[PDB]
Ligand binder design. Structure first.
Ligand SMILES: CCCC(=N)C1=C(O)C[C@@H](C[C@@H](C)SCC)CC1=O
Ligand SMILES: CCCC(=N)C1=C(O)C[C@@H](C[C@@H](C)SCC)CC1=O
Ligand SMILES: [Co+2]
Ligand SMILES: [Co+2]
Lengths: 377, 377
């Protein structure tokens, strides 16, 4: 049941912005670990005296890494005369965010038809404003509202390059890495209380509802923008990983980003080759019993060769009534046990592919526990 | 003339500590870009609730990357009950350092015979104390005094692993990268006023004296610990790069680290292969006229094949009366035009090799200007 109740026209995920202490080092690490190219910059060399911002791309996936310069470089500026390319940026906010949360996602950005209208309608419907609409070079409009914690939902709309003031990166500095990642599939928040969080966000967007935790997913009209939200469940034997997140993150924030691959086997081969030479580490693989049990569940979708390929790469498999999901999770991206990445590929629900085909892997809670007990043997 | 006036027994450079916002991402980037292995850690997985610290090694070179966790994780602790492995660490100091300077060197650490005695004698001779001697596990003593800006000189002494509380890194996470770097040759500070800086440091150590700037080098008795210091020269047509450093760094700090390679050609081949895939970029190469003029200066030390190999890698060559120096400089390591790295190899002054063989490249100021004018042609 999709009531198509979006209060404004949403298109697709546009970009994710990380707030960093040093954007250069984080962007270089992510580029090598994920196979994303350097594609745009806004920094001192482009006349930005306020913040350093570096854009990585893989397919339609856009990761932005931003860090503040010394406020002394821009002490003479006022907002009307700013050299910042992202007018919502604030030195104090950025330093406070990073000191409080460490490395993490500041903005989940979605492309909309009219960012000024989306902002107005959102705020009229309960959204807490964060940055009012600003028109950039008469070409792009950006606005921001609070999503959860210190994470903002950023609206971007184009009348017709990434943003005005960003320069394309010289091909010499731009090496064409590509491990197969193509777009953001969903972005997941952790909050202390799921009920109020859902009511707030669904309140101002009109998005509809699509062990250790309770969870729910908000979706846009075509269900291509997907925003799951988790809350902890207290009292269990093993401490809730959602609660661990909230403690180490100092409150609510973005938990994980799910990146769709057009060939998850190639992506995971390439990422695992680089885990120990600057890239990303992966969660421990499920036991061999999990992969023996895959024949009964998905033996009609994957060959036995494709199933053993899942086993050597540590990939998880789940299935609902509509499609099948291949997924795997990285270890945390930074010092704190907070944000991590999921790599996914979906098979089925062809019409293009419909959003959320195969679900989000909820069936792997019981399947992993069963395989861990069965492999104890 | 070496008067051998060290006021305490100094051995060698021991390690360099960077203060970071996220130690994981910086350490992974540096490991891949420089070919250093992950060798020790102190973090949540080792029981450290205060800071995340990761040690990289190449030969005798030790780079330490440290970042603070949320102070809430350790709110119940006091110094007597701390889980920090580096007792001098302070959340407030680290956050203030990184907000003020961005990514940079906090500590230049030297091994001494007795850190408690070196601290006492230093402070008795004008050193500004930073952290008093602390004995770790009855095995290692650490103490710190101010060097310049917010950089400290750290004394380390061993009675007989890196530091107590650090754990060796599991070989799976430890990939044996090595591009040929073997030790720290010298570490260079930028200050507003050279005279007072020299008087202060030479005052408390007893170290002896060994365009756009004035400079001088302080050295230990065997001249294996080398600490050059720069000051700007104002008024020139081209603005002093020392002054640019001080503005973007918000004052004095460490300008560059010079890393000795046992095979600079191999090091530069390996580093240049990775410049655009997560590693480090290099300053623009000198014109071909510079390399034509190399035959007259060093044609008796390097073959013409070895000289063309310098040319394809962009290596600089200088020579004093005692030896010859091969060197090259990276672009800045992070967002700000502040800290960078020099790769060097020295030929000559065999006895072992004496410290500072070939100087520091001062002759390349005139040689580059001459080659740039000659190549204008
Ligand atoms: C926020 C909820 C939506 C969502 N994205 C989500 C996840 O990705 C994690 C899945 C759990 C197991 C795969 S974890 C064991 C390796 C289930 C799930 O529901
Ligand atoms: C602090 C001074 C000691 C020192 N380390 C030092 C440097 O490394 C830079 C050298 C200058 C040219 C190579 S720069 C043009 C590429 C000269 C020099 O004196
Ligand atoms: Co997910
Ligand atoms: Co040097």
């Amino acid at each position: 049941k999709n009531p198509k109740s979006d209060k404004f026209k949403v298109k697709r995920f546009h970009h994710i912005e990380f707030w960093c202490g040093d954007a250069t080092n984080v962007a270089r690490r992510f580029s090598w670990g994920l196979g994303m190219r350097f594609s745009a910059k806004s920094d001192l060399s482009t006349g930005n005296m306020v913040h350093a911002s570096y854009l990585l791309t893989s397919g339609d996936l856009r990761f932005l890494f931003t860090a503040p310069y010394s406020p002394s470089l821009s002490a003479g500026e006022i907002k009307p005369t700013t050299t910042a390319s992202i007018p919502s940026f604030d030195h104090g906010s950025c330093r406070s965010f990073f000191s409080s949360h460490g490395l993490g996602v500041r903005a989940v950005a979605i492309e909309v038809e009219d960012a000024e209208s989306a902002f107005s309608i959102s705020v009229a419907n309960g959204a807490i404003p964060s940055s009012p609409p600003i028109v950039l070079n008469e070409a792009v409009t950006i606005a921001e509202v609070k999503l959860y914690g210190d994470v903002v939902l950023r609206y971007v709309s184009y009348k017709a390059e990434f943003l005005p003031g960003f320069e394309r990166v010289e091909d010499a500095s731009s090496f064409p890495l590509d491990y197969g990642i193509r777009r953001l599939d969903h972005a997941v928040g952790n909050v202390p209380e799921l009920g109020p969080a859902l009511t707030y966000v669904a309140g101002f967007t009109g998005f509809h509802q699509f062990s250790g935790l309770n969870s729910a997913v908000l979706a846009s009209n075509d269900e291509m923008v997907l925003l799951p939200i988790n809350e902890p469940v207290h009292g269990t034997k093993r401490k809730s990983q959602i609660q661990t997140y909230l403690e180490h993150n100092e409150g609510a924030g973005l938990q994980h980003l799910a990146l769709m691959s057009e060939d998850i086997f190639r992506t995971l081969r390439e990422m695992r080759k680089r885990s120990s030479i600057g890239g990303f580490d992966f969660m421990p693989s499920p036991p061999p019993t999990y992969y023996q049990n895959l024949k009964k569940r998905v033996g009609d979708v994957l060959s036995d060769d494709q199933i053993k390929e899942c086993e050597e790469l540590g990939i998880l498999v789940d299935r609902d009534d509509q499609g099948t999901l291949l997924q795997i999770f990285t270890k945390p991206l930074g010092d704190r046990p907070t944000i991590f990445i999921e790599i996914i590929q979906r098979v089925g629900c062809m019409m293009y592919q419909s959003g959320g085909c195969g679900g989000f892997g909820k069936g792997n809670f019981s399947e992993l526990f069963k395989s861990i007990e069965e492999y104890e043997k």
